[PDB]
Design a protein around this ligand. Structure first.
Ligand SMILES: *[C@@H]1O[C@H](CO[C@@H]2O[C@@H](C)[C@@H](O)[C@@H](O)[C@@H]2O)[C@@H](O[C@@H]2O[C@H](CO)[C@@H](O)[C@H](O)[C@H]2NC(C)=O)[C@H](O)[C@H]1NC(C)=O
Ligand SMILES: *[C@@H]1O[C@H](CO)[C@@H](O[C@@H]2O[C@H](CO)[C@@H](O)[C@H](O)[C@H]2NC(C)=O)[C@H](O)[C@H]1NC(C)=O
Ligand SMILES: *[C@@H]1O[C@H](CO)[C@@H](O[C@@H]2O[C@H](CO)[C@@H](O)[C@H](O)[C@H]2NC(C)=O)[C@H](O)[C@H]1NC(C)=O
Ligand SMILES: *[C@@H]1O[C@H](CO)[C@@H](O)[C@H](O)[C@H]1NC(C)=O
Ligand SMILES: *[C@@H]1O[C@H](CO)[C@@H](O)[C@H](O)[C@H]1NC(C)=O
Ligand SMILES: *[C@@H]1O[C@H](CO)[C@@H](O)[C@H](O)[C@H]1NC(C)=O
Lengths: 238, 41, 320
């Protein structure tokens, strides 16, 4: 909880200080504003006509001679409009792809937990939180990052009684003298046991198998009370 | 005094993993990371 | 990515002609638009390459001993006996896919801009990704690279597809032999079976054909007496010249607009392909995917990246 609180507090600074993203929304806004500005500035081009003002051409010419300048202006402005609409269509396709990606991320990172690598942030995705931004969305991805790795000796299997033992869920590790089994993403050493392991074949196939004791709690209790029963019988007989 | 300098890109730090025949690295801690992704809609 | 192209409007339409440039000034900001669009395409190409290949925090290196439980990675591992430390497969890919027409294209305002990342840098990124995935499994993609024996990593992958790890530990020699045979057959099937690898050449051919059409459109009169600006300027007075100059300007402006629009559409397609490639690098090379047929046919075990001219090759190792 403390780590999450610290990271979410640092978000309010890193969103606007580290930059990186959040320039995409401003880029969209700038592209649209620049396109509209270019379209409305193209109205000052003569395109080969005497003037770029329609009223001037209408006031200074007869309809026969006016029609040529009017047609030049019409061709130029129609070309400007067609260019603007084509660029708008291409940009709309790009924005549609981005919005499809954002909807997928909302479904798979906010409404669930994703196993896809780097789809909902760097590391092992825990959860995600949506926020609204002008013409866009911000996803705060909460992920799990392994931090303090330690060195261990490892074996693929353990040989105890001519049988190869494999970890049910985890990895065999050793600090140098003792052998444990731990979960693969967090160091939590446990004594190697028939509960943590399963048997498959003998010790003549696996490459890298080591002898180590695999403890059996059932047999431990059984022979522990068997010794007491033997003592009881010995004291009863003599 | 600062000046404009040109250089070749560094792709990142060089890290030779201590890969071995029976050696494993296992994390003893973790960090909760909150990262940000901005998407135009 | 695709070829980054820059166009000088004044050179293309009104090459070193002042009268034609003064007439072209009357058409407004069409050419600033074209220049901006081409600049955006080039920056997007660099962004595509970075987003696909710059997926490693560190440049990971493989230990000098190249034993990984019997697996044979030498055909995809870097070759130090080369100026660019490309692998065998990468060298084959770069030799078979190859990028006067170029001089003439450069001769009228149409230049080609080099990519920001050199092929050596892309090979370095691919080498780092390969070293990370074969020395640390999927751990390097989620944080610090944690070393693990390759047989144990493969046992993890077998667990990730629903098979107990004792199966791999008891068939390790067979699995290594099968992988070695398949990776050996890759060097033949990549260029013999065809199928793909025509996509990169198709991109190259499309860009070259577009540039060739653009530079060939300069020989069209478009209703003018001549397609040469100097001829029109030498054989006519400015009043009568202006009509032919305007015809040529309209034709060449239409050609430039067509070229830039097709470039924008092709750049959108290449951007979609590069986003797909970046997703595949994240989810097949930096991890093990459960998505069906996303990282090859069968149950995905792992994937290896290789660099190719203007593209990426993914070698998907799956369980069948
Ligand atoms: C792993 O153990 C086997 C089995 O040895 C038995 O179990 C051991 C834990 C110990 O109590 C031994 O005395 C037992 O015999 C080892 O195989 C032995 O190898 C030695 C040397 O060649 C040989 O003299 C014994 O007869 C073998 N034992 C059997 C039952 O065949 C094996 O060498 C051990 N591996 C390692 C790396 O130590
Ligand atoms: C990891 O184990 C392998 C497999 O046995 C070792 O590779 C062998 O090394 C010996 C010792 O020189 C050679 O005689 C063999 O030819 C090697 N085999 C192969 C297939 O390469 C490797 O040396 C071991 N690693 C370490 C650090 O000892
Ligand atoms: C695991 O990591 C946490 C977080 O870094 C460690 O907690 C820190 O402990 C130090 C030393 O006592 C304190 O100064 C910090 O303030 C703690 N940080 C936080 C966020 O609480 C923790 O000690 C580590 N645990 C182990 C077992 O290594
Ligand atoms: C493990 O040991 C190797 C070899 O001594 C060393 O280089 C590496 O840093 C160690 N790893 C960790 C996580 O301490
Ligand atoms: C390995 O762990 C065991 C169990 O706690 C401990 O007794 C032993 O000292 C450890 N070995 C080393 C070298 O730290
Ligand atoms: C590893 O790869 C190369 C390339 O195919 C091959 O020639 C070499 O013999 C292989 N080594 C082994 C031990 O299989």
């Amino acid at each position: 909880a403390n780590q999450f609180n610290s990271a979410i507090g640092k978000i309010q600074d890193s969103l606007f200080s580290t930059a990186s993203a959040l320039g995409k929304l401003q880029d969209v806004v700038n592209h649209n504003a620049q396109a509209l500005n270019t379209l409305v500035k193209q109205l000052s081009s003569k395109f080969g006509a005497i003037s770029s003002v329609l009223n001037d051409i209408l006031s200074r010419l007869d309809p026969p001679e006016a029609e040529v300048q009017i047609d030049r202006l019409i061709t130029g402005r129609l070309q400007s409009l067609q260019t603007y609409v084509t660029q708008q269509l291409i940009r709309a396709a790009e924005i549609r792809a981005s919005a499809n990606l954002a909807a997928t991320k909302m479904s798979e990172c906010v409404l669930g937990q994703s196993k896809r690598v780097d789809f909902c942030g760097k590391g092992y995705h825990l959860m995600s939180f949506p926020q609204s931004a002008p013409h866009g969305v911000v996803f705060l991805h909460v992920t799990y990052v392994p931090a303090q790795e330690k060195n261990f000796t490892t074996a693929p299997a353990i040989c105890h009684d001519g049988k190869a033992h494999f970890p049910r869920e985890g990895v065999f590790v050793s600090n140098g003298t003792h052998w444990f089994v731990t979960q693969r993403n967090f160091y939590e050493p446990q004594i190697i046991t028939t509960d943590n392991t399963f048997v498959s074949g003998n010790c003549d196939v696996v490459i890298g198998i080591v002898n180590n004791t695999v403890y059996d709690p059932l047999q431990l209790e059984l022979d522990s009370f068997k010794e007491e029963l033997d003592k009881y019988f010995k004291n009863h007989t003599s | 005094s600062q000046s404009i300098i040109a250089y070749t890109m560094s792709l990142g730090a060089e890290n030779s993993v201590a890969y071995s025949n029976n050696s494993i690295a296992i994390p003893t801690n973790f960090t909760i990371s909150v990262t940000t992704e901005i998407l135009p809609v | 990515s695709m070829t980054k192209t820059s166009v000088d409007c004044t050179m293309y339409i009104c090459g070193d002609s002042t009268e034609c440039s003064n007439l072209l000034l009357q058409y407004g900001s069409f050419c600033t638009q074209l220049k901006r669009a081409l600049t955006g395409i080039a920056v997007e190409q660099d962004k595509n390459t970075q987003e696909v290949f710059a997926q490693v925090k560190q440049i990971y290196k493989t230990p000098p001993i190249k034993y990984f439980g019997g697996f044979n990675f030498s055909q995809i591992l870097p070759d130090p006996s080369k100026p660019s430390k490309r692998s065998f497969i990468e060298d084959l890919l770069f030799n078979k896919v190859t990028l006067d027409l170029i001089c003439a294209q450069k001769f009228n305002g149409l230049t080609v801009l080099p990519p920001l990342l050199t092929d050596e840098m892309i090979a370095q990124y691919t080498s780092a990704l390969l070293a990370g995935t074969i020395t640390s499994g999927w751990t390097f993609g989620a944080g610090a690279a944690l070393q693990i024996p390759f047989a144990m990593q493969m046992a993890y992958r077998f667990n990730g597809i629903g098979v107990t790890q004792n199966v791999l530990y008891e068939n390790q020699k067979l699995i290594a032999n099968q992988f070695n045979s398949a990776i050996g057959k890759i060097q033949d099937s990549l260029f013999s079976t065809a199928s793909a690898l025509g996509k990169l050449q198709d991109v190259v051919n499309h860009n070259a054909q577009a540039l060739n059409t653009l530079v060939k459109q300069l020989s069209s009169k478009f209703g003018a007496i001549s397609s040469v600006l100097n001829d029109i300027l030498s054989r006519l007075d400015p009043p009568e010249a202006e009509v032919q100059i305007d015809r040529l300007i309209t034709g060449r402006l239409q050609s430039l607009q067509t070229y830039v629009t097709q470039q924008l559409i092709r750049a959108a397609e290449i951007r979609a392909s590069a986003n797909l490639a970046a997703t595949k690098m994240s989810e097949c090379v930096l991890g093990q995917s459960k998505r069906v047929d996303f990282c090859g046919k069968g149950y995905h075990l792992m994937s290896f990246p290789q660099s190719a001219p203007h593209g990426v090759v993914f070698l998907h190792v799956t369980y069948v």
